[PDB]
């Protein structure tokens, strides 16, 4: 089906120490494939997925130099922002960046991203048209002017529609055994009696890949959106995922409820009722 | 494959 590549960068200022902490990771869909950490001993890009290991020494030298420069940039970005917003130096601050591309089922470019947040709030982002920037405040407008003068969107488009996509296909075909697989959810239901008149029902979804899944509860065919308890989809640790959803149900009224699972791995959407 | 252009803020 559809696939995506993403890189995530986090840099955090450390007033109690000299250097900021910088962390970078790469994902293909929901599988991490590389990392870099400014405090690691190696000071190199490291592989995190079996199938990125078949890449040559030329790939590793290149990704390492590019990431170290990403690192230096974001170290300096910290200073620049602390300047823009007139903040002192004693307090820790976080810059986050993300960029990457998506491809359709035909493996052709669909969309691309390049966005930042500062201290958790959106700062600037590439727009869907891939030629414009969104800047939320006046500080970000300063960044937007620098970038327009240096034609960054046009250079980014070049990367997003060429390099990002080409690499993604390359990864998809080497990690075919991992990345192009489909694992359907293993599903079951559990009952718990909170008290004399009420009871929680949980709809379990296990061992599935990729992470996208949909769990909805129904009462008499109707969507029970509010009253449904939904946990964050969570990694099992072996490249599969787990999710559940629960509803507080009146004692003896259990069998009027239905759980509905949706997943790419699933030939037909399943409908679970308690027995 | 990372990008090789490094814009600043």
């Amino acid at each position, epitope marked *: 089906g559809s696939h995506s590549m993403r890189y995530f960068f986090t840099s955090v200022s450390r007033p109690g120490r000299g250097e900021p902490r910088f962390i970078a990771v790469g994902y293909v869909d929901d599988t991490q494939f590389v990392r870099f950490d400014s405090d690691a001993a190696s000071q190199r890009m490291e592989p995190r997925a079996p199938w990125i290991e078949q890449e040559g020494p030329e790939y590793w030298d290149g990704e390492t130099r590019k990431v170290k420069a990403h690192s230096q940039t974001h170290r300096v970005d910290l200073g620049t922002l602390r300047g823009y917003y007139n903040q002192s130096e004693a307090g820790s601050h976080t810059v986050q960046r993300m960029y990457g591309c998506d491809v359709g089922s035909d493996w052709r470019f669909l969309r691309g991203y390049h966005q930042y947040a500062y201290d958790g709030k959106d700062y600037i982002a590439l727009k869907e048209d891939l030629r414009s920037w969104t800047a939320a405040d006046m500080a970000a407008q300063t960044t937007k002017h620098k970038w327009e003068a240096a034609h960054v969107a046009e250079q980014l488009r*070049a990367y997003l529609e060429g390099t990002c996509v080409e690499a993604l296909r390359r990864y998809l075909e080497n990690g075919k055994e991992t990345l192009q697989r489909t694992d359907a959810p293993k599903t079951h239901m559990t009952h718990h009696a909170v008290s004399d008149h009420e009871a929680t029902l949980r709809c379990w979804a296990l061992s599935f890949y990729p992470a996208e899944i949909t769990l909805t509860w129904q009462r008499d065919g109707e969507d029970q959106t509010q009253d449904t308890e939904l946990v964050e989809t969570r990694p099992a640790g072996d490249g599969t995922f787990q999710k559940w959803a629960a509803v507080v149900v009146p004692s003896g009224q259990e069998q009027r409820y239905t759980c509905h699972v949706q997943h790419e791995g699933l030939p037909k959407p399943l409908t679970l009722r308690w027995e | 494959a990372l990008w090789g252009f490094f814009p600043v803020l």
Partner: T-cell receptor
Amino acid sequence: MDSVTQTEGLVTLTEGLPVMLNCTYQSTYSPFLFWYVQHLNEAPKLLLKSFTDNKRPEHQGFHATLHKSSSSFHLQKSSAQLSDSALYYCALFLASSSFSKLVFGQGTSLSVVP
Amino acid sequence: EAAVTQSPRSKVAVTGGKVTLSCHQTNNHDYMYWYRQDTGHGLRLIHYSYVADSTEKGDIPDGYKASRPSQENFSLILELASLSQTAVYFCASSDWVSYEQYFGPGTRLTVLE
């Protein structure tokens, strides 16, 4: 692959006639090109950028248009003048997959005569 | 402004001697580059640096070493000069907008038997 090909050698042009220096390239990814100039016994410096809309970034002075279809970035001017005599470099900028670097051509010497 | 300086401006060296070209730059640029100029080869990158205390190999690093002791200074080093290395050498610098590089005046080196 990822190269630059310029007009080979010395170009001799009579003042007041149109300059026309050839650059063609080969690029894997979307092309960004730059003309540098070196006057005799001077530092090379940036002359022009391939950015702009379509392929026209400068009028009376030097200008160039990028044609992606035939991979051309020819340097042009309407009326050469003696002060234009210099060495001109065509450069490809690679910053998509590889770390930002300029890939220069062999340069073309322009000699404008009275 | 953006003014790069190089020294020496000229040098006559013997084959197998140690040669050190120096660059200095006060433009607050993190990026520096060393090129060499020849006939029918133009400007070929030898070494570059994106931050103080690190160097990367360029298109033609062989026979050359590089040093970035600080943001301002960037050295090109020939340990055993050879006739092939007779050329004009250029040092350049830029900020993040790295396709706009500012060049030093240049250094003419000649190597002799």
